[model samples]
Each structure stands twice: as structure tokens, then as C-alpha cells.
Target: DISEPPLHDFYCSRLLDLVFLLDGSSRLSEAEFEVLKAFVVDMMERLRISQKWVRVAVVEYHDSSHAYIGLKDRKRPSELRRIASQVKYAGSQVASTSEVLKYTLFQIFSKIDRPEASRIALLLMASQEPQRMSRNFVRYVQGLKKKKVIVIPVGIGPHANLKQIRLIEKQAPENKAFVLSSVDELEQQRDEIVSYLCDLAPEAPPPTL
Candidate 1:
């Protein structure tokens, strides 16, 4: 069988602002949550994550949202991986989607130092039913649209809600949302996932003297 694309050969010319909105609720066990963190690292390995190429941020939400890493963080990929690994599961019962989206949009994406970077958010969700549509939720989605942030919800596990994923998918660009049987699948599909993200990246401008 042909192997996946070589890591060194992959390059996204555009600057990418990638944010991970993780489900830290009790819906997933600690072991399952750890798998989610590993998935994040797996995806990061495929991209050009750096101050100049791709800026990564992470927000974990259960009853509330907490920004683990912000866009301003200039940590190297290795350091970021270490941080991701250190994250503890929140284990909250209620995963409040609106507040997290609001936080990610304002607290994280709003801090982007480079406006030219294409904004993308990965919603790693395991919840079978997301919070029902509310006025604030609509506003939050509109807010993300105003900021040009592409929100792609990744439904994880057999219990994941396809309907909720489809609801979130309405905000993503064509062919962007994903459904995986398990977090382990993320590594197997890494190349295809990263390539699609690269396609959404805006073209990098000419360097200034």
C-alpha cells in the first residue's frame, strides 16, 4: 500500500490560525479524553505550526470554557504537545456550547496578531445532543462568521450525534465536517484532514523588506 504524504514535503503557504474547541465534559471518560488530546497532537504534527506559518490555540469546555493556549502563544510544536498532554479532563456534566463559542471567538480568535491568517476551529465533540438552538447560539455563529472563522465539528465515538454535527456543519465550508468512530481514526486520516485544512488557508502575501 502507498504510504501517506511525507511530513517534510507538506507546506501550507498561508498563515493558519487553528483553534481546538475540545469537549471536556463527563460525556467522555478520562481515557477517552486523553485520546482526544493525542488526536490534537497528531493533527499538529502534520501542519506547519509556528508563529509565521500556523498559530494554534486550545479551549476546553464542559460547563464553561477555559483557554489552554491562546493564539498569542508562540510556543514551538513540541512545547505545545507537552502542554496538550498535561491537560486534565474537566469532567463537567453540562457542556455549554454557547459560552465556549463566545470565548473562542473573542478570547482566542480576537487575539490574532496576524489578521491575514485564515481562521479555523475544530470542535472535537462526543456529546450525542448539543445544546438546543438558542438566540445566543445563533449570535455566536454569526459572530464567528463575521470573523471569518471556519468551524468544523468532528463527531467522535459511536454515541456522537450526527444531527448536532450537521447543525454545526452548516457553518463550515463545503466538505469540512467529519465523523469518526473513534479518536484513533484521526491519526489514520491525518493526511486527508490536514490537506483539506490547507485548502481553506488564504494565500500568503509577499514578504516585506
Candidate 2:
């Protein structure tokens, strides 16, 4: 009989790299932004974040992107939570989700030395206006896909473009885009996101001698 897979079943002990590409545009209120930070902290709490196993990075963007946490920075969950709470809102009138995606893949993901670690990007889109993609954006998405990087786009707020989100990437495992009416709902999605990540995690490489 065909049945949905349970969350616990997907638990994996493999090398994985995660990047939280967040939106720091004015479209989200400061309070809403705080919710986003909280979501990141909660997600880190659920993941196996450490120097040897799952490494994580946090990048924020509005018109431009900036890294708050780099993959090389090995910090505990408490330290990550402290840093997440301090993230500043960029408040730029110009918002480009595509550029941030490109930045993360190149500047953030590319720096990882581990080719065996599965790469995952949690892109949070908070644009009230429709977002446009550059030629390079499309090219990079396809390029990252070829490198086996999984991009999970999260559309925040009522006006967040679902079409654009889905259009951004289409690496198998259908239904990858997530729609949230508000940042408040992000907390509810924590478990679901983790479970999905686990499902996509590549099998751990044979133990090294």
C-alpha cells in the first residue's frame, strides 16, 4: 500500500551544508522580521549543526546580500541564536531575490570544500511586489542544480509571488515551494522543512579510515 513517509524515517547522519538566504527588505515589518529570525534559530535547533557534520550559514539581502554567518564559522546553537536575533533589516527600496540567490551560490555555497556534502538553500522571499529574474539568475539556478544543490523557496506574505518562486528552480521532488501568509506561520513549518531536508539528504559516505 502507498502511504506518506513519516518524518522520523528520513533521519540521516550524513554531511550536509545548509544556507539560510533571508529577505531583509521593507516589505516585512520589524516584528515580522523578528519572526523570521526566530524561525532560523528554531531550524538550527532542529538540525545537526556542527563543524564536522552539518554546517550552516545565514545570509540576509535586500538590494544586496550580506553574510551574517559563514560556513567556516563553527558556533554552537546558542551562539547562532544570539547572532540571528541581532540581524539588521536592510530596508532597501530595491529588492532583488535573484541576485541574492546568485550571491549565495557563488559567494556562500561555492566556498564549501566538501563536494560530498549535499547542499541545500532555504530561500525566504518577502517581496510585496513581483520579483524579476536576471538572465544570470536563471543560468545560475540551472548551474547549481547540475551541482546537485537543492533550493527550497519560501514565499512569505500574501503578495509573495508563488509563480516566481516555482519558476526559480525545478529540480525534481515536486512541490518544493512553500507559501506562508505571514512570517508568523514560519514556526509551524519548522518540522516540515526539516523532514523534507532529511528526505533529500544523500546517504552518508562510507566511514573514512
Candidate 3:
């Protein structure tokens, strides 16, 4: 099933470019990491992931951020799972969300080649508040919103920073902003998450300009 499907099964509702921005800082146990990966794989299947449909990429950031070339250099689901399995963890004294976000937007976001797909970033933070986020950074995120990109924050652990998540994006619906402690908690929200993402809808073909 991981291979290319027949023309009939080879389709999806929209072109969705989903960028998973991970907090590579060593905050989770090995078991916890496995849960996270399982959740992603399940979600990918439910979403009908493919290079033609949902083109997925990943960015792991701590004191610094890196877009996995072996992981994200391609968008095939089989290849993605392989790279996800090989992701390395980073241990840092303090993690800066702002720094990573800046790096992602300025350096990484532009490199995405799909100009017509719906762009969405899922930022999964596990164990710390961002060291710093500037006023300009806030506005920079807003500017992305202006361009039809949706940036989502998935807070982690009991001390999930609601205020910090709020600052990163515009008003998120009550549960959409996330306040989960574990992948188990997040598991309870599977339906809600998929529903929220579907609400964004597929992009229509551009008009004649």
C-alpha cells in the first residue's frame, strides 16, 4: 500500500503542504517519542498522505533548527516514515521558539517548492517556554496569515504555555490552540484535529490575472 496506487486511488481533495516543526530538545522519554511518531503516522494515513496530495516536511529545532534533508528532501509517505524514525534529538540549556520560527520562516519556508498548495505549519513544543519572541516576530507571523498560511501551535506537558501559543498566531478556537500533556491526551483529540484541518479547505485554481 505504500507504493504508488492505481489512478483511481491516487487522489486527494486538496494540495496540502504540512510542515511539522518539532522541538528537538531532549524533553521526552524514548517511550514518549514513540507515541509522538505513532500519532503522526496515524494522522498521515487518515489524511491520505502523498506527494501529490499532502506534501509533508519536518523541521526540528532547539537552540538551532534543521530541516531534515534525508527526511524531507522527498515527500513520499514511505520515505517520510523512514526519516522520522532516524530523527536525532538535541539537548540544549535553553530553547528559543522565536529564533527557530524566524529561521523556519525566513530560511526554510521559502524553499518549499509548492506555490499553489495550502501551507500549514504544526509547531509541537514539549518542555519549555520560548526564551524570547520579539514584537516584530509576532507581526511577522501575522504577515504569514495575510498570505493564507496557517501557523498552528501544539502545546505540550502540564505547563503548556497558552499565552506563548496565543502570541504565535491569531485567535485560535478554544481547543485548536492545544493544551495536551501527552500523546494519549492528543489521541482523544484526533477527530477534532482532523475536523479543524479540513475546515481550511482546498485552494481553488488561481484566477486569470
Candidate 4:
């Protein structure tokens, strides 16, 4: 028999392993939750997602972390959209934001971490954040920074704790900050990032400009 495909080749094909982590706590009203869903769906719609392309996983946190999809599971963009449609709020509770962030940075990554992956990004959307995070949380973020983890902290209105968001953004590749204060404002964040990620395509991506 011949040889199998290269492991690195299989890894490089999916240039990005992204996690969409959301807050389903009571901070967001039912109608406001719709805004969050739209953001994720639209962003997913714009990406070149597939099992062999950019793969993604969905997770939420309230009291503790909850997994709607696992990184090991393969899903196309359509499948992702379907999952998004059925997403329900995890319930209104005072969940530790730091707890969730730490969980996402560690627990969710153990299985999906790949040396061949060009980048690991987390689309972190939150409406509630504390003024100060746990020491462990800060240390966790430092680890993410050292390993080049991209944390896109999407602020959900003015209520998203500014201090907490700044801490999260510090871990992003470019220290980019995204705010979802309005419909118009949210559109630009998704499009700009999508355009930038196009360069990661195995095929020559269309000119972003």
C-alpha cells in the first residue's frame, strides 16, 4: 500500500480552529439575545467554513461551561448555522465570567490544539463582566498570549465590563477590540475580520480591498 496523507497537511488545510463562546446569563434580555444570535449567524455565513476548511465549535457559560458542539466534531457552514438557530439561552444566573474564560482557554483547547494550525481564535461575546478577574484568570490569559491565542472580545452594549474586555483584548493577535453597541457598528467588526482571515485560505484569496 502507499502512504497516508501527511498529518501536517491535514492540519494546515483547516487553517483556523475557532470557538464561539457566548454568555447566556440574565444580563441579556430575550430580545437582546436575538442580536447576539444574528451576529454569530452572520459571521458564520461570511466565513469559508467546512470540516477541511476553517472549523468552529460553539460553547456557552453561565454557572459553568456548557458545550453545544465539540471541536473534534466536523461541521459545514450550513450545519453551523443550523446549530446557531437552535441555540437557547443557558438561563439567567450569576455565573463567573472569569470561570468561563479560563475554561475556554484550557478545557476547550486540550483536544483541538494543533501545532500545524496557523491560529486559534475565540469569538468571545459577553454582556456581563466583573471589574476584576481571578488571579488564575489573568494567568490563564497570559498563557494564551504566550501561545498566540486570539481573543476577540465582542462587547455587548455598554454593560460589558470595560476592564474585563480590555483584559481579554490584550490576548488578541492585534489587541483588537470589537464592540456590539449597535447594528451598524457590529457589521464592520465581522466584515473586517472576515476579510483579514481570507488571507489564510490555502487557495489565493481574493484581494480584501
Candidate 5:
């Protein structure tokens, strides 16, 4: 009888998972939203990554509330492209820094499988003022760190709360966070961000005491 190689051993260094938390709040115009979506698609295509190996999810947030898709199941590139093309800015609404942040962290914890030999990263894009996040948000972020998830926060436009973004960076370990000054540059910057991720050390089993 022939024995097959283990799954993890076969492709231990070839997996990459990326989740995008997009701010759908009233602050961005329809055109801006379209640009952001297009940028993401372009970035993925340029990286030569396949839909099957690369997991993509999106969470839209506004006014202390958010709606999400692809949390229960990962989406392929074609599916993600279709969804991105269909996305439209609903309207200008109030911003809740805490709610959006907490929601994202919760989704990450519940959806991601820790045992999988894949690199997981979060990309958050927002353009608004920062409101105090709930204690739950802080706790959730801390838990994500413990689980070895990397959180990268990008500030879009001048209205964005840099302070909140800084806080997010602090929560993540070294080289786990980032900020962008303009939404217009998301396309150009997306590739750079992915490049940085590709250079990071591969995920390994937790060190024993």
C-alpha cells in the first residue's frame, strides 16, 4: 500500500488568507467605494494568487453598526469580483470606531481556524473620526494577538482618526499595522502592502515554555 503525504506538509508555505473590513459608512461617496473595490481586485490579480488558496471576506460598517458577508464561508476571486462590482455606498451615517473595530475582531476570531498552516491578515479601511471603542473591542484584539492574527489598519483621507489607528497598531505586534493617507491611493498601495506581507516570517507552532 502507498501512503500519501500529509496535507499540511504538502503545502505548508503556500497558503495566505486575507480579510478586508471596509468602512461602508456614509462618509464615502459611491465613486470612492467603487475605487476601493477595484483596487482590491487589481491587487489580488497582480499577486497571481488563486481564489481557492486565497480566502477573502468583507465587513461593511456604519454608525456603530455593520453588515458582513463571507464570514461563514470564504469567497473565490470571481465571486469576490462580482460582489465588489455590486457594492454601492448607501449614505452618510454616523461613525462608531468602537463598534466597527469590535465587530471586525469578533468575526476574525469566530471565522479563522487557528490550526491551519496559513498566514492570516486583516486589512481595515476607514475614513472617519474615532470614537472610544468598548472594552470588549480591546479584549477581542488582545485575544487575536494571542491567536497570532495580524491586524493592519489603513486610514483613508484626512477625516480618519489617526489616534484610533495608532491604538490598533499598538494592539498588534511589530509590523502588523499600517496607515494610508488617501483613499485614492488604495490601488497603488495595495500591492505594496501585499509585498510586505509576503516577506513576513511563516507561521509556526506556538513555542513551548
Candidate 6:
């Protein structure tokens, strides 16, 4: 199953800002692309979020640039699915971690509304070495952390550089980065990722402060 194994339920009601930074530029075969698409769609459904409270954005990187799209506009599921189906795998060119990270941070901070108590999470899936690191990469990551955004990087394929991913994640506290060595197991790990995100979600304030 793509979801995590059954565990104790920890239910909380809060808005979630979710972004998917996918490697749409991979030179994957058509079959592989289809699998990736299906996995994404299935994962969305499994999240069990009503369109009203959850907003999802997608950014695809290839050749060092990203193609940006919003999964939900005006809380429309049909539109979201349409956009998701249009996502294709192309451009095997390498990516720039700095560019991708910076773009994501900018979009999140500038475009998405940050409610007083909400959780923001990023899911980054890549399979190649990044180009030059941007000078602002660390600052941008720190900014996101200040805003309480938790980043989960999933390195697909054996060629992925775990060290680079870890470096990007260093801005966050420990256990904020994850590297998946196999694309075949990505679906199975989605739930585990969600569980981690749940842990990072905002908690009720103590009576004292």
C-alpha cells in the first residue's frame, strides 16, 4: 500500500499548505511517467483533505527551471485533477537545487497565506545532482523555517545525491529530511511522510503562553 501502516490516530483541525516539487524533467519512459502520475493522484486522494481547507501547488523542475502550477484554484477538484493529468515527465536535464528551493520558498512566502496556526510542508522529489548552489539558498531555507515550514526531500533513483539534500535540509531541525533510495518504494512511503508532516503541524498553545 502507498500509505503508512495503521497506527494510532492523531487528529487535528488546521489548514495545511502543501506543495509538491516534482522532477517532471526526468527522461523516464511513458510507463514510468504514468506510474508517477498515478502515485501523485492516489496520494492526494489518500490525504482525505476537503478542498476547502487544503491548498496544493506543484512545481516541476527540468534543465534548472521550474514549471509552476496550482492544483487547487477556488477549491475545485475537477480542475485540480485536470491539472494533475497534464503533468508530464520530460527534460532529463539536471536541476539546480538553489533555483528550485528559492523558487519554492518565494512562492510559499509571497503567494500562500499563512494563517495564525497552520502547517506548511514541501515534498521534493529529484533524481540528479543539482547545479551551482545559490547564495540565498540557506537564507531562504532559514526564512521558511522561521515561518514554520517543514521540508521533506525525497531522493529518487540511485544517482540522487543524499548529501546535497541533507545540506538543504540542515536549515531545519533534525529529522526534517528524508531520502528514498528507490522510486519503486515511493508510494509505500507517502503515508510515512504524511505522518511526519502531521507531527510538525501546529499544536494547541499552552494555557500559560
TM-scores for every candidate against the unseen true structure: 0.85, 0.85, 0.77, 0.77, 0.74, 0.75
Badly placed stretches (over 4 Å) of model 6 are 1-13, 27-30, 48-52, 64-68, 117-119, 133-135, 203-209
| Candidate 4 lDDT score at position 174 | 61
| Model 1 lDDT tens row, 1-209 | 21223256665546899888888878789888988898887777667777777878888987678877877777767777678777888887777667778887787766556888888888887774355623477578668877888888788887665665676667645426788888778777777877888888876778799
What does candidate 2's lDDT look like per residue over 1-209, in tens digits? 21122224333455778888888788888888888988987777666666556678899987678889987786665677579779997766656777877887778766557886788888898883334545466677776676677888899986565666777655446328888889988988888988787667666667798
Candidate 5 residues 95-129, lDDT tens each?
Answer: 66566556656655555564453444444556553
lDDT of 5 at 29: 74
- What are the root-mean-square deviations of the candidates from the true structure over C-alphas? 5.1, 6.6, 4.7, 7.0, 7.0, 5.9
Q: Between prediction 3 and prediction 6, which has the larger lDDT?
A: 3
Judged by whole-model lDDT over C-alpha atoms, candidate 4 comes out at: 0.62
lDDT of 1 at 200: 88
Clashes of each: 0, 0, 0, 0, 3, 0
Best by lDDT: 1
User: Which consecutive 10 residues in model 5 have the weakest lDDT in total?
Assistant: 1-10
- lDDT (Cα, 0-100) at 92 in candidate 4: 59
Give the Cα lDDT of each candidate: 0.75, 0.74, 0.62, 0.62, 0.57, 0.58
| Clashing pairs for predicted structure model 5, backbone only | 26-91, 26-92, 26-93
Clash pairs, model 3 backbone: none
